[PDB]
Design an enzyme around this catalytic site. Structure first.
Site, PDB file in Angstrom:
ATOM      1  N   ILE A  95       8.404 -10.588   1.186  1.00 47.19           N
ATOM      2  CA  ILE A  95       9.174 -10.676   1.876  1.00 47.19           C
ATOM      3  C   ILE A  95       9.573  -9.436   1.303  1.00 47.19           C
ATOM      4  O   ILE A  95       9.901  -9.015  -0.144  1.00 47.19           O
ATOM      5  CB  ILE A  95      10.592 -11.591   1.411  1.00 47.19           C
ATOM      6  CG1 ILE A  95      10.800 -12.974   1.938  1.00 47.19           C
ATOM      7  CG2 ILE A  95      12.293 -10.559   1.712  1.00 47.19           C
ATOM      8  CD1 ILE A  95      11.983 -14.030   1.245  1.00 47.19           C
ATOM      9  N   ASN A  97       3.935 -13.994  14.594  1.00 49.42           N
ATOM     10  CA  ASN A  97       2.608 -15.188  14.237  1.00 49.42           C
ATOM     11  C   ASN A  97       2.591 -16.188  14.340  1.00 49.42           C
ATOM     12  O   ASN A  97       0.557 -16.763  15.367  1.00 49.42           O
ATOM     13  CB  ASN A  97       1.783 -14.500  13.554  1.00 49.42           C
ATOM     14  CG  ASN A  97       1.341 -13.271  13.000  1.00 49.42           C
ATOM     15  OD1 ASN A  97       1.267 -12.603  12.150  1.00 49.42           O
ATOM     16  ND2 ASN A  97       1.033 -12.668  14.424  1.00 49.42           N
ATOM     17  N   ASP A 115       4.087 -10.838   6.535  1.00 55.42           N
ATOM     18  CA  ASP A 115       5.691 -10.752   5.805  1.00 55.42           C
ATOM     19  C   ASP A 115       5.941 -11.647   6.717  1.00 55.42           C
ATOM     20  O   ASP A 115       6.273 -12.164   7.697  1.00 55.42           O
ATOM     21  CB  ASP A 115       5.395  -8.838   6.774  1.00 55.42           C
ATOM     22  CG  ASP A 115       7.262  -8.913   6.713  1.00 55.42           C
ATOM     23  OD1 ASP A 115       7.842  -9.383   6.036  1.00 55.42           O
ATOM     24  OD2 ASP A 115       7.099  -8.099   8.139  1.00 55.42           O
ATOM     25  N   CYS A 128     -11.722  -9.922   6.832  1.00 56.33           N
ATOM     26  CA  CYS A 128     -11.223  -9.585   7.983  1.00 56.33           C
ATOM     27  C   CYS A 128      -9.255  -9.785   7.527  1.00 56.33           C
ATOM     28  O   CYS A 128      -9.321  -9.966   6.057  1.00 56.33           O
ATOM     29  CB  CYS A 128     -11.643 -11.177   8.342  1.00 56.33           C
ATOM     30  SG  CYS A 128     -10.654 -12.288   8.205  1.00 56.33           S
ATOM     31  N   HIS A 129      -8.717  -9.459   8.393  1.00 60.61           N
ATOM     32  CA  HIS A 129      -6.564  -9.842   7.644  1.00 60.61           C
ATOM     33  C   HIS A 129      -6.682 -10.817   8.211  1.00 60.61           C
ATOM     34  O   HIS A 129      -5.954 -12.071   7.427  1.00 60.61           O
ATOM     35  CB  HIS A 129      -6.534  -8.861   8.733  1.00 60.61           C
ATOM     36  CG  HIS A 129      -4.139  -8.799   8.299  1.00 60.61           C
ATOM     37  ND1 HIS A 129      -3.639 -10.393   8.980  1.00 60.61           N
ATOM     38  CD2 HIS A 129      -3.718  -9.017   7.424  1.00 60.61           C
ATOM     39  CE1 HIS A 129      -2.773 -10.405   8.433  1.00 60.61           C
ATOM     40  NE2 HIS A 129      -2.526  -9.590   7.666  1.00 60.61           N
ATOM     41  N   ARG A 138       0.715  -0.933  -0.156  1.00 64.10           N
ATOM     42  CA  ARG A 138       0.044  -0.545   0.164  1.00 64.10           C
ATOM     43  C   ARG A 138       1.334   1.622  -0.004  1.00 64.10           C
ATOM     44  O   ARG A 138      -0.028   2.481  -0.532  1.00 64.10           O
ATOM     45  CB  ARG A 138      -1.094  -0.521   1.260  1.00 64.10           C
ATOM     46  CG  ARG A 138      -0.418  -0.081   2.437  1.00 64.10           C
ATOM     47  CD  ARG A 138      -1.419  -0.009   3.426  1.00 64.10           C
ATOM     48  NE  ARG A 138      -1.361   1.170   4.180  1.00 64.10           N
ATOM     49  CZ  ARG A 138      -0.931   2.006   5.224  1.00 64.10           C
ATOM     50  NH1 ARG A 138      -0.726   0.668   6.151  1.00 64.10           N
ATOM     51  NH2 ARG A 138      -0.834   2.588   6.006  1.00 64.10           N
TER      52      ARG A 138
END
Lengths: 275, 275
Positions: A221, A190, A182, A159-160, A23
């Site tokens: 990446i 995570n 990421d 949602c993400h 973004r």
């Protein structure tokens, strides 16, 4: 050794990923669609090819569990979403609907960060724990998280993250679908974070942890992490550590940072990667 | 040959799946967490190890696209959710909020199956197509589907399916996360169905189809499909067919059954599997 999956995925993105902007117009190497399976049986998938900040993963997770939206409440482990807030409420550290609020008060009208939301909105986390106890065969044992910058941007944003639990033979498994990941920074965090959540829920439901499955949409990446990740790939994983819960706990809200001990954690040195 | 992934997954569930009951107490073999990648480049993943009813996949998909909730509107390709409906509206074929309604009028109050919902609720499908045109790098190009029996059962039920699109280098890719998948019946149909949706969206956005990724939570084989699936595993896949779109089409609502032709489809015989 399941850290090999993670490293396999870094390599694949490096060899086969294609250039794609995020973004902010910052560049990534991107592959769409990946999956890794990490066993939780008598081990805990805290990555060993770099030191992962576990104490902070713990503490961020306790904060989510509390339902906080107060930046100040975060412990030592402390974007565009801030622009849609008023001035003076923002300087208080009132972050608005974040992961806690969404997990514990899903769909409630968010007022201020000190309000009483007792019994307002859907308690996704408590609903998950309840469904495991009332019907462990259920295919809907699901909790979703939203990127908070999305909430003011459109009606009914997606949602993400979609987190699904699963029970068979006394084992609790967890699958996290993330629409983007990421690989250098967010992913390792995570993995530890949802593996820890799984350990917690298993503990209070009388189950044993099973598997952690991590599924990504846009696995990427950042260009500025290529070189350190290339170095990380040369390191050999070391047996994962164990996670021990130190007292018997009954409700998800009662766990405390001090209830958890990692052991046998021999990581390779910190890799500093910056966002 | 990517049908090998599907067959690999059938074999794995047969060797390693564990016994688990579904909502009706009917038995399955179950594995939690799987993923397959099907290329859409100059081929279309209509499974070849049994004849898949493509004409009906097409027609069910056109029906979803229309937003219908009228059972009668379904063409030749025609559970507990019916119990929550009134009598006389149910005999009309008014099914309530189904896949069409959720895709085209997400969150609107569902009245009757002949009502005008023009501009009511979120048009997920049109939002997907728009975001591809306005920002193809977006990581939120997502459309969700609900099992309709869930809608009367609880507040804010989780989706059954999360479909995410992805664009790079002029290629449109699609990832479907399904919280459960019946490998014998639903999965092959779903692969064709979302691959077809992807072909459609690509056609109207000036992209080329890329990949179809299929991710499952509870991947299961019903006990009564074991023997036919064991026989299906002995069959060798044959090169996938091609899908051809026969005229230039501009809006997703304008596609018609007759715009599509499959070619070079040499499947092995029908396997009758019953629910």
């Amino acid at each position: 050794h399941g850290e090999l999956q993670y490293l396999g995925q870094i390599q694949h993105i490096l060899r086969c990923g294609v250039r794609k902007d995020d973004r902010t117009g910052t560049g990534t190497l991107s592959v769409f669609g990946m999956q890794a399976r990490y066993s939780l049986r008598d081990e805990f998938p805290l990555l060993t090819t770099k030191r992962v900040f576990w104490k902070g993963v713990l503490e961020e997770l306790l904060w989510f569990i509390k339902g906080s939206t107060n930046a100040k409440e975060l412990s030592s482990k402390g974007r565009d979403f801030l622009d849609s807030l008023g001035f003076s409420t923002r300087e208080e550290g009132d972050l608005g609907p974040v992961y806690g609020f969404q997990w514990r008060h899903f769909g409630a009208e968010y007022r201020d960060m000190e309000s009483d939301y007792s019994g307002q909105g859907v308690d996704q986390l408590q609903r998950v724990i309840d469904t495991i106890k009332t019907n462990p065969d259920d295919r809907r044992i699901i909790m979703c998280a939203w990127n908070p910058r999305d909430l003011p941007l459109m009606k009914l944003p997606p949602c993400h993250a979609l987190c699904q639990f699963y029970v068979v033979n006394s084992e609790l498994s967890c699958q996290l679908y993330q629409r983007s990941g990421d690989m250098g920074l967010g992913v390792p965090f995570n993995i530890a974070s949802y593996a820890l959540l799984t350990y917690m829920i298993a503990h209070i439901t009388g189950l044993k942890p099973g598997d952690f499955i991590h599924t990504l949409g846009d696995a990427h990446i950042y260009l500025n992490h290529i070189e350190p990740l290339k170095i990380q790939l040369q390191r050999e994983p070391r047996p994962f550590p164990k996670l021990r819960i130190l007292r018997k706990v009954e409700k998800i809200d009662d766990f405390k940072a001090e209830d958890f001990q990692i052991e046998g954690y021999n990581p390779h040195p910190t890799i500093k990667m910056e966002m």
